[PDB]
């Protein structure tokens, strides 16, 4: 686990180099973004229960065969384990958003998650549908004003969409 600032230092140390002036200014504008990054993380954790339980409700409506007897999410424990995995992935994606780096997300959330779902028999293509339903439920909740000053957050919301896409290809 290393953030976006330590990712630059880890690359410079293997070269034996100081950080040049064009690299410090690329890091001084990450500080300038700053408050806009913490506004995104505040908005996806304050609604973190609503992101999971709405995207789950919209996943068994499109795929009703998951909750039929014989489906992978039919029982009390198999339904609660379905909502559990979505909260874990959403937790680690917000760790990578506050870090600026997807290192913590694939260190300890995505390593072996694909081979876990093959062992259990869980359809990993339907798990990817659930990550994408949590993606746009939190992308749309990032770019609404609602107590924030007006400005451009377009590069940070594109960064947050990249973590949801990385988790959705590392699962199937």
């Amino acid at each position: 686990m290393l953030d976006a600032f330590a990712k630059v230092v880890a690359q410079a140390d293997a070269r034996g180099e100081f950080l040049s002036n064009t690299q410090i200014d690329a890091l001084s504008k990450m500080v300038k973004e700053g408050n806009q990054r913490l506004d995104i993380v505040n908005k996806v954790t304050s609604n973190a229960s609503a992101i999971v339980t709405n995207s789950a409700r919209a996943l068994f409506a499109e795929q009703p065969q998951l909750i039929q007897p014989g489906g992978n999410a039919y029982t009390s424990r198999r339904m609660a384990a379905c909502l559990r995995d979505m909260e874990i992935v959403l937790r680690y994606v917000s760790y990578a958003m506050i870090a600026g780096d997807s290192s913590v997300l694939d260190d300890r959330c995505l390593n072996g998650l694909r081979e876990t779902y093959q062992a259990l028999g869980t359809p990993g293509s339907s798990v990817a549908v659930a990550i994408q339903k949590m993606k746009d439920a939190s992308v749309a909740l990032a770019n609404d004003t609602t107590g924030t000053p007006i400005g451009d957050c377009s590069s940070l919301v594109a960064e947050l969409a990249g973590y949801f896409d990385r988790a959705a290809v590392s699962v199937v």
Binding site: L2, A10, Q11, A14, R15, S103, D106, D107, L110, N111
Partner: peptide, 26 residues
Amino acid sequence: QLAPPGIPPGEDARNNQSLRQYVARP
């Protein structure tokens, strides 16, 4: 993808390894 198993992503030890002393990761 990710790092290989066990490797803390970003703390690899083969970043700027010389080629003359490089050892292929099993």
